[PDB]
Design brief:
- The structure is cut from a larger assembly and holds chains A (about 325 residues), B (about 160 residues), C (about 45 residues), D (about 120 residues) and E (about 180 residues).
- With about 325 residues, chain A is mainly alpha-helical.
- Helices cover about 65% and strands about 0% of the residues of chain A.
- Chain A is globular and about 65 Å long.
- Chain B is globular and about 60 Å long.
- Helix content of chain B is about 40%, strand content about 10%.
- With about 45 residues, chain C is mainly alpha-helical.
- Chain C is built from 1 helix and no strands.
- The N and C termini of chain C lie far apart (about 90 Å).
- Chain E is α+β, with helices and mostly antiparallel strands and about 180 residues long.
- In chain E, the strands form 2 sheets. In chain E, strands 2-3-5 form a 3-stranded antiparallel β-sheet.
- The two termini of chain E are about 40 Å apart.
- The chains are: A mainly alpha (about 325), B mainly alpha (about 160), C mainly alpha (about 45), D mainly alpha (about 120), E alpha+beta (about 180).
- Chains in contact: A-B, A-C, A-D, A-E, B-D, B-E, C-E.
- The interface between A and D is large, with 73 and 61 residues.
- Bound molecules: 1,2-diacyl-SN-glycero-3-phosphocholine (3 copies), 1,2-Distearoyl-sn-glycerophosphoethanolamine (2 copies), ligand T2Q and iron/sulfur cluster (3 copies).
- The site of one 1,2-diacyl-SN-glycero-3-phosphocholine has 4 residues of chain A, from helix 3.
- Chain B: It catalyses: a ubiquinone + NADH + 5 H(+)(in) = a ubiquinol + NAD(+) + 4 H(+)(out).
- Chain B: It is a peripheral membrane protein.
- Chain B: One of its GO terms (molecular function) is quinone binding.
Chain lengths: ~325, ~160, ~45, ~120, ~180
């Protein structure tokens, strides 16, 4: 039965990645006064399959300057982790109940960067190396605030488990007490994915494609789908932590429904933002995260350390 | 359940994919690049057809030679084309690219991009109306509709 | 009938007046309002 | 065992995709195609040379900040303790010293990049 | 006259209200929310995208696209081999060879146009004193071969015999403006 559950958790995520590429294109088109794919199928529901099939039908590249081992490992790892981050998620019941699920998320995400690093290094092209170093800077920038934001939120949950947030929000979202932390977490998830305005790892206007510039159809598809999967993942994280779906033990289907609605909202917001803003300079990202988010993050961490004490609202350990 | 029929349908599918997803390359040399843009614009939405400008040749499927090709630029054009992975198509846009055009008798112009790379479709004009470039894209789509590769493999 | 000179000339009295200056409007709350809303939300959530 | 199962399933999915991407399509390999990409022209050098880093100090600092995060993470448990005043005081001291170090770096222009 | 774009700034006066407004702008991301609102407004507008190749972009009679040699309503050719068209063609795309037709008239044997050299400028149809060579409206004449784009007398004559119903009307419309 567990393998069937694996399927019911995996194949829909990939279909959703594909139709997320679709929704991205169509939303950006209508924002840009254009339509977006409507030719390939009814309103374009076959463009993703066309793209994927076409890519996995193309000649891949085995250049002469590359370390083929890492060149091939990196996309494998990217996709693997993009799919593995979805397992401990409660919707409302997870496939793998982990007590330290938050830390699993953190570590797997911090690991997904090495796909970019090793790809850009192996490719042995200057633009690839530039994308890799930009990823290094981006991680060094956001990873400090990520964990402190998350700790400050969890100090009212009582644990690193993703299933106690459901009982924590049983009456009221965690956005009201933590909307500053929610905003900073939103932007930091925006950065974790190398997504606009932080699309610096593949900045087409400075670096033709970054770490992808030597990669070709299949591996490139792997990278791309990993990106568009981590997008949905981080939206789901935002909407399990700060937004709380209705949990009535006799009605988990409503929980899944509302979870999906909120995830769609947050993802469409990601696309909105890509369409609405220019791109940062990768030094300004560091300056932001280290001069506006980290000081405030420490202040709020102290605030949420104290609040349970001068309120007697310390959470329980299971 | 004839294998020849199955192969014809499979080839239809292959071509449908490679056709409804044509990612060109951000390679514009001269005026004709403006009409390329305008064909990317709302009135003529490229993505509507599955067309997407990717900047890396290792990800592109077709290159539109959108303007004049000088002798100082031909090596780079041939290199980029060489770096595009098969299946790879080419589209000559304008009169400069087809036969040098208004600069045919110049000392610094190749009298046709068809000397440096092989061209599938020629789009005439100076500049070609974006509508015409789209007509050419669809002409290419049909040419791909008529590749019949696996049938050939089965007949070998 | 006859034939006078015909030419794409403007209409008598001229064309309507054209707007060319910036009109980025002014909107939003008062600032105090934003901070009060946020602080009240924090306090209710804490309770 | 189930976590192992899921993760290995994902490994196998990715590897299957890569296999059928490397063995399904028709190839035509030659040097001018397999050569590095530097915007149409030939590289003037190798990409394996020192690429100077202007945020080295910020990265070093990031190491220590990661450690301070590691020390802050046990709070969810430290708040279940009877000695609450001690936990409060120690957490406040830790975060304050962290902020003071950051402020000293800021002022002495460590967070700014070498040019 | 002149105006300033970024010197408007005058001496600094600051209150608590102004400080708080700038603080909210810096903390709640006011100015970015407005770009979000603009992009939202555009999502609920009608896209300017036409449904090509079914509905097409507008044009005017003066449009100068594909070339064609016309005829008089009797069927006789209008060209008389005067060679202004090739004398002015700034791309040297036209090539002509004349000879006395058996009936004695002055007519061509060769009339070639390298449509890879034509810049579609229109000088030939404003030079032709008999309105023989024109630049028709057709622009959907792409090819799969370079050779197909090297027109001769027969190709241009066939185009003229194919578009006359349109070329003639566009002329009738535009010939007073010339
Ligand atoms: C844990 C790390 C393992 C530490 C022990 C080393 C075991 C592997 C040594 C074998 C030599 C590998 C090597 O360095 O070759 C260079 C190559 C670089 O490419 P290359 O230089 O060999 O390119 C050769 C080109 N062909 C294939 C045509 C001959 O990198 C590797 O193969 C090793 C990368 C390390 C990956 C370790 C994780 C393995 C994951 C499981 C699969
Ligand atoms: C989650 C990802 C989903 C996307 C991946 C799904 C892709 C699945 C596509 C299934 C279609 C299978 C047929 C694709 C074959 C295309 C390869 C090709 O074009 O090579 C032609 C080749 C050409 O054969 P050939 O013998 O004529 O080549 C002669 C030499 N050249 C090419 C130099 C002239 O045909 C084949 O040999 C493939 C036979 C089809 C069966 C293969 C199995
Ligand atoms: C879907 C419908 C939603 C539309 C969202 C897009 C914005 C619509 C357009 C609005 C616009 O034009 O700009 C309005 C204005 C533009 O104002 P302005 O620039 O014209 O002038 C503002 C005047 N001062 C400086 C004094 C404020 O911007 C805003 O009002 C933004 C409000 C703050 C947004 C807070 C975002 C954080 C949300 C999480 C925290 C939740 C707690 C709330 C705390 C407050
Ligand atoms: C091979 C090359 C490719 C390698 C990349 C593979 C993807 C790596 C994904 C990132 C994983 C990093 C984090 C480490 C694994 C997570 C550990 C974990 O979550 O806990 C292990 C779990 C029990 O955890 P817990 O819930 O806290 O304990 C109480 C349970 N009643 O139960 C367990 O003890 C199971 C421990 C196994 C962990 C899975 C590792 C699989 C490795 C496959 C290779
Ligand atoms: C008694 C109370 C006790 C509790 C204590 C807390 C009290 C409340 C305190 C509230 C503080 C406000 C919330 C903090 C978040 C904002 C942080 C911030 O202001 O950063 C501003 C930063 C710098 O902006 P700049 O104009 O360049 O100024 C530079 C300095 N001279 O620039 C930025 O960081 C923002 C730029 C980011 C641009 C990226 C794109 C943003 C997209 C916007 C999407 C908005 C949607 C939000 C969705 C959230 C849902 C989860
Ligand atoms: C000027 S703009 O603002 O309009 C600008 C905005 C951005 N934009 C855009 C956005 C999203 C996608 C694309 C097309 N595109 C698709 C892929 C790629 N997709 C898949 C893939 C694999 C499996 C899938 O599911 C299944 F097959 F079922 F497994 C589905 C897909 N692999 O690679 C890679 C590169 C790429 O550009 C384009 C349009 C233009
Ligand atoms: S054909 Fe005409 S429009 Fe196109 S690049 Fe040449 S001169 Fe410019
Ligand atoms: S339109 Fe201009 S360039 Fe073209 S054939 Fe006529 S005169 Fe020559
Ligand atoms: S200008 Fe007209 S009449 Fe004279 S040679 Fe050219 S086509 Fe013939």
């Amino acid at each position: 039965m567990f393998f069937i559950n694996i399927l019911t958790l995996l194949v829909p995520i990939l279909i959703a990645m594909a139709f997320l590429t679709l929704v991205e294109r169509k939303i950006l088109g209508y924002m840009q006064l254009r339509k977006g794919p409507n030719i390939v199928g009814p309103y374009g529901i076959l463009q993703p399959f066309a793209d994927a099939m076409k890519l996995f039908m193309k000649e891949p590249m085995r250049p002469l300057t590359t370390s083929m081992s890492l060149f091939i490992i990196a996309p494998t790892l990217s996709l693997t982790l993009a799919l593995s981050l979805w397992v401990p998620l409660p919707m409302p019941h997870p496939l793998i109940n982990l007590n330290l699920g938050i830390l699993f998320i953190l570590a797997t995400s911090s690991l997904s960067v090495y796909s970019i690093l090793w790809s850009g290094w192996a490719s042995n092209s200057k633009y690839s190396l530039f994308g890799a170093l930009r990823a290094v800077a981006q991680t060094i920038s956001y990873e400090v605030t990520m964990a402190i934001i998350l700790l400050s939120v969890l100090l009212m949950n009582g644990s690193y488990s993703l299933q106690t947030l459901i009982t924590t929000q049983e009456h009221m979202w965690l956005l009201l007490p933590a909307w500053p932390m929610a905003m900073m977490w939103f932007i930091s998830t925006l950065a974790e994915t190398n997504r606009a305005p932080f699309d610096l790892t593949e900045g087409e206007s400075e670096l033709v494609s970054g770490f992808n510039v030597e990669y070709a159809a299949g591996p490139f598809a792997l990278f791309f789908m990993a990106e568009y999967t981590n997008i949905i993942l981080m939206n789901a994280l935002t909407t399990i932590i700060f937004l709380g779906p209705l949990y009535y033990i006799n009605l988990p289907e409503l929980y899944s429904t509302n979870f999906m609605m909120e995830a769609l909202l947050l993802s469409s917001t990601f696309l909105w933002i890509r369409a609405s803003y220019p791109r940062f300079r990768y030094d300004q990202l560091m300056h932001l995260l280290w001069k506006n988010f980290l000081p405030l993050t420490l202040a709020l961490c102290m605030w949420h350390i104290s609040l349970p004490i001068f309120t007697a609202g310390v959470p329980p350990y299971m | 359940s004839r294998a020849e029929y199955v192969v014809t349908k499979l080839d239809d599918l292959i071509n449908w994919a490679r056709r409804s997803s044509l990612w060109p390359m951000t390679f514009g040399l001269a005026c004709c690049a403006v009409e390329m843009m305008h064909m990317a614009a709302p009135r003529y939405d490229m993505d509507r057809f599955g067309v997407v400008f990717r900047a890396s040749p290792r990800q592109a499927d077709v290159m539109i030679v959108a303007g004049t090709l000088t002798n100082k630029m031909a090596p780079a054009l041939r290199k980029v084309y060489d770096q595009m992975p098969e299946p790879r198509y080419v589209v000559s846009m304008g009169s400069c690219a087809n036969g040098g055009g208004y600069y045919h008798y110049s000392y610094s112009v190749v009298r046709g991009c068809d000397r440096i790379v092989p061209v599938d479709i020629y789009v005439p004009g100076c500049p070609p109306t974006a509508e015409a470039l789209l007509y050419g894209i669809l002409q290419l789509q049909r040419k791909i509709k008529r590749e019949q590769k696996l049938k050939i493999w089965y007949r070998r | 009938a006859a034939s006078k000179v015909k030419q794409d000339m403007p209409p008598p009295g001229g064309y309507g007046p054209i707007d060319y200056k910036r009109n980025l409007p002014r909107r939003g709350l008062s600032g105090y309002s934003m901070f009060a809303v946020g602080i009240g939300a924090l306090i209710f959530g804490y309770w | 065992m189930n976590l192992y199962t899921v993760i290995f399933i994902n490994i196998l999915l990715s590897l299957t995709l890569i296999l059928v991407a490397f063995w399904l399509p028709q190839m035509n390999l030659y040097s001018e195609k397999a050569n590095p990409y530097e915007c149409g022209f030939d590289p003037t050098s190798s990409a394996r040379l020192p690429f100077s880093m202007k945020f080295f100090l910020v990265a070093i600092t990031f190491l220590l900040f990661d450690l301070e995060i590691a020390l802050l993470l046990p709070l969810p448990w430290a708040i279940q303790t009877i000695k609450t005043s001690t936990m409060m005081i120690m957490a406040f001291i830790l975060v304050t010293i962290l902020s003071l170090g950051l402020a000293y770096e800021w002022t002495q222009k460590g967070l700014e990049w070498t040019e | 006259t002149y105006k300033y774009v970024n010197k408007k700034e005058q001496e600094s006066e600051v209150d608590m209200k102004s400080a708080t407004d700038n603080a909210a702008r810096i903390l709640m991301w006011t100015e970015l929310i407005r770009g979000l609102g603009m992009t939202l407004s555009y999502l609920f507008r009608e896209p300017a995208t036409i449904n090509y190749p079914f509905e097409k972009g507008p044009l005017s009679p003066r449009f100068r696209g594909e070339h064609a040699l016309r005829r008089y309503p009797s069927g006789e050719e209008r060209c008389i081999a005067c060679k202004l068209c090739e004398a002015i063609c700034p791309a040297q795309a036209i090539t002509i060879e004349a000879e006395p037709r058996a009936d004695g008239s002055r007519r061509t044997t060769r009339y070639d146009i390298d449509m890879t050299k034509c810049i579609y400028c229109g000088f030939c149809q404003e030079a032709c004193p008999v309105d023989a060579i024109v630049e028709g409206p057709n622009f959907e004449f792409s090819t799969e071969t370079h050779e197909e784009l090297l027109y001769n007398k027969e190709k241009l004559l066939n185009n003229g015999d194919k578009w006359e119903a349109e070329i003639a009307a566009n002329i009738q419309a535009d010939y007073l403006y010339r």
